[PDB]
Design a binder for this molecule. Structure first.
Ligand SMILES: CCO/N=C/c1ccc(OCC[C@@H](C)CCN2CCN(c3ccncc3)C2=O)cc1
Ligand SMILES: [Cl-]
Ligand SMILES: [Cl-]
Lengths: 297, 245, 58, 245, 50, 58
């Protein structure tokens, strides 16, 4: 039991996150109301105090005489799903014949979509994101040609054996999900759930993944968070002999059922690496176009 | 009646006679983790008053040429008071914060500081200048401790992002002709219910002069900026021996 | 359709309307969602809110 | 709450944070001419928003030796905006006015301007000095246009009358230690329901320093006085070709 | 007829000259009322703003 | 079918009958429309209409 007053009247423990604001429906843009000339002392909408940290609450109606306008412009196209549920390139896998990279008939792709600017800049607008996704795999030769080749794609989650060759025992794929398809067939396409161990993936992790002294050698792990590492995507020509043709697989991702939290300033310097926000120091450019003077267009 | 305020929590009280309201980050107050969101099974410890109080950690000098600084939470308190001890003895930690940046001058000084909070504030390097070197920021820079760290390139917040858009984050301004402090309440922000106070900095505090300090020869030239902050609804779990990193 | 509730948006305030042919909910279309929005969360997160006609600092 | 104000009319808005209330001349608001007072039979045109708005016409510099100036209504707007066009195309015109004289300084400057409105402000000449010459003021002086005209002998308002008694007319003062503007609403004043905006100036606006401007070497010496005004309830009738005088 | 909102809610045309003051009868000079010492803070008749 | 009302003819006097399989209405077939027509709009837009048996100019 609890008998001492400070304990009874304590707030220690309420899990109810009291919120100052709530969402209202807004299918269309706000209408404009008729307004007239106001010559008052005391009331002053135009004057603000930006130091407070809130945006101006001054409206059209109070700054000029307005007419009535019934605004039925839709706000549907700016929802997260409308913005993100458009498939874009996030990975390329090369399977050349007599080359340097993969002359063995197979390839392992670390599942990381940060190798392409377009898609990357979009998702990096938010800090945390939770979503399902539709992946489409387009394959063809380097000339965009289609040939009668059978391929096998396999998802190798963290902990599963990564194939070390075109003939690796791992391709038995008894538990991992695999897809067999011909280049002649249409692009393979599957749905992928939200697989993180966290409640959301995060494009930014200001921290280290483990304890201990964080000496120079291990500074490569700064910002690396396992909750964002979903695994490996392996592909191979299905055979015991080298394929007769060189191949390329372009991976497209289309997010769906999206939720995001914490907006961030949008990237304004060229991207350099997948794992970090490093930018070219001798080449810091302004965010946009510049002009000769502040008094001339 | 909005320019005057008092913040009392724990055995500490702050007063200001030139405030500009209070910001409550993302519109919500700090709160303890519910039994639904929680996942770890051990009963947490909630020290309350011994750790949820105002700690005044550091003072910087504002100069006509200052670039701006940043501090990281909870990195700043990990070695201070009873809060620090709990952060070290426990694996798991979570809390909110009440931040109060102070900076007063005279009615003849001018200048404006942008005080903001940026969740998951990852730092980048200039990549060897040419962008061909894959360098990484050292521990001393990602977790600067109480001393904070001075920004190298404010325009891009040392992370390839425009400071012009930093206002999309909870923030206030300290415009010397208007107020002498900024106050921001921040709730726990993370994709997990609890986390390590040591390996993960939930957010960063940025204090950057957007409008340079200025005054006439003869006015006090030493204008300090002091950082005071208080954890809120601190919870700790996963007890063991003390660990500093 | 009586399936598995494994969509990323299961238990979300915004009401979705989708199509699906598999037992797993995340395989469903993106569909249409509710058009609610809360600007104040980011544009006006002040403790004591001030009116449009008043002097913000008094 | 009386020192702060906002005037919005048309697509124009004025703000002031150091006002001293608002004067409504002879205690009554501008209003359109009633069917009883009216005499001309043609249906008038009432442009509304395109002409009843704030026009900022002129700026003068206040100096330690300034004498004071005057402007005439509606002479000041006859060649400006849509209002001017209507004044030119129509024989008949009538309207009220909202006048807002602006002049700010610093808490270290001093001085007081008397801002008044004088109906039927007829100008006189010094009659050859001896009073034996029956001279008359030239068009440029009776209707100075937007540039206004500087008073020759303020004490007698260039018309043989004491400025000491000018306060018997709608007025306000701009005392630098108190306010930085004067606002006066004026209704249509005349012995006829409508009249020519060209041949007749219903009233004059006078801005005269009664307490001379002063300050110490080193304070901004350029102190402007800007005149902004807005017609109210403008009505025009008797359309024909445009005429400038 | 008038259908567009701004026209319906318009003030264009009222001939009623709204007056801020009205005349009261005053055949004689105003009387003087008894008054006593007031030592208040807040109330201040003597101070004006010409 | 509960979809988006983004067809070019949404809010049109002529009643359409169409088929569709997507959430967006404009993806629908052309269908059949109402057979109303108003010739007079172009063939007889006179202010004061005259009868067939009368002398048009009187
Ligand atoms: C039969 C084989 O078919 N399987 C296809 C497949 C496709 C995608 C799969 O997982 C995709 C997971 C991605 C949506 C996760 C992308 N993310 C999550 C956050 N993140 C990231 C990257 C770099 N820094 C921080 C976060 C990412 O790159 C798994 C299998
Ligand atoms: Cl200590
Ligand atoms: Cl013009």
């Amino acid at each position: 039991g609890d008998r001492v007053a400070d304990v009874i009247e304590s707030s220690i423990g309420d899990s109810v996150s009291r919120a100052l604001t709530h969402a209202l429906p807004a299918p269309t843009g706000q209408n404009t109301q008729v307004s007239s000339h106001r010559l008052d002392t005391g009331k002053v909408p135009a004057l603000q105090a930006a130091e407070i940290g809130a945006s101006s609450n001054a409206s059209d109606e109070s700054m000029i005489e307005t007419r009535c306008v019934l605004n039925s412009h839709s706000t549907a196209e700016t929802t997260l799903d409308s913005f993100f549920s458009r498939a874009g390139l996030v990975g390329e896998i090369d399977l050349p014949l007599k080359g340097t990279t993969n002359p063995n008939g197979y390839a392992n792709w670390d599942i990381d979509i940060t190798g392409y600017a377009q898609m990357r800049r979009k998702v990096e607008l938010f800090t945390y994101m939770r979503f399902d996704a539709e992946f489409t795999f387009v394959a063809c030769t380097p000339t965009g040609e289609v040939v009668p080749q059978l391929l096998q794609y396999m998802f190798v989650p963290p902990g599963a054996p990564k194939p070390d060759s075109r003939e690796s025992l791992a391709w038995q794929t008894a538990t991992n999900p695999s897809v067999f398809v011909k280049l002649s067939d249409p692009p393979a396409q599957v749905s992928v759930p939200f697989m993180s161990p966290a409640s959301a993936y995060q494009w930014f992790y200001d921290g280290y993944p483990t304890f201990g002294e964080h000496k120079q050698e291990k500074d490569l792990e700064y910002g690396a968070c396992p909750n964002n590492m979903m695994g490996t995507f392996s592909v191979r020509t299905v055979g015991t002999s080298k394929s007769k043709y060189p191949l390329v697989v372009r991976i497209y991702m289309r997010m769906k059922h999206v939720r995001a939290w914490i907006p961030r300033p949008m990237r304004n310097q060229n991207y350099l690496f997948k794992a970090n926000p490093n930018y070219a120091g001798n080449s810091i450019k302004p965010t946009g176009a510049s002009r000769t003077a502040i008094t001339t267009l | 009646s909005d320019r005057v305020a008092q913040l009392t929590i724990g055995n500490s009280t702050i007063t200001t006679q030139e405030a500009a309201n209070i910001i409550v980050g993302y519109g919500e107050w700090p709160s303890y983790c519910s039994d639904s969101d929680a996942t770890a099974v051990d009963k947490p410890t909630r020290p309350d008053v011994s750790v949820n109080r105002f700690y005044t950690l550091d003072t910087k000098l504002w100069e006509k040429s200052s670039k701006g600084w940043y501090w990281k939470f909870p990195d700043v308190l990990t070695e201070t008071g009873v809060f620090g001890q709990n952060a070290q003895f426990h694996y798991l930690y979570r809390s909110g914060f009440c931040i109060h940046v102070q900076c007063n001058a005279s009615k003849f000084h001018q200048g404006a500081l942008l005080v903001a909070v940026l969740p998951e504030y990852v730092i980048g390097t200039v990549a060897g200048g040419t962008g061909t070197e894959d360098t990484h920021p050292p521990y001393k820079q990602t977790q600067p401790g109480a001393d904070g760290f001075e920004l190298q390139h404010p325009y891009v917040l040392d992370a390839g992002i425009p400071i012009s858009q930093l206002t999309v984050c909870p923030h206030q301004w300290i415009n010397l002709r208007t107020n002498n402090c900024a106050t921001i309440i921040v709730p726990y922000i993370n994709a997990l219910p609890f986390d390590s106070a040591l390996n993960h900095c939930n957010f960063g505090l940025l204090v950057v002069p957007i409008s340079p300090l200025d005054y006439d020869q003869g006015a006090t030239p030493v204008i300090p900026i002091t950082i005071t902050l208080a954890p809120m609804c601190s919870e700790f779990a996963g007890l063991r021996q003390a660990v500093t990193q | 359709s009586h399936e598995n509730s494994n969509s990323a948006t299961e238990g979300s305030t915004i009401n979705y309307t989708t199509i699906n042919y598999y037992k797993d909910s995340y395989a469903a279309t993106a569909g249409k969602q509710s058009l609610k929005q809360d600007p104040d969360k980011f544009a006006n997160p002040v403790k004591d809110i001030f009116t449009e006609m008043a002097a913000p600092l008094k």
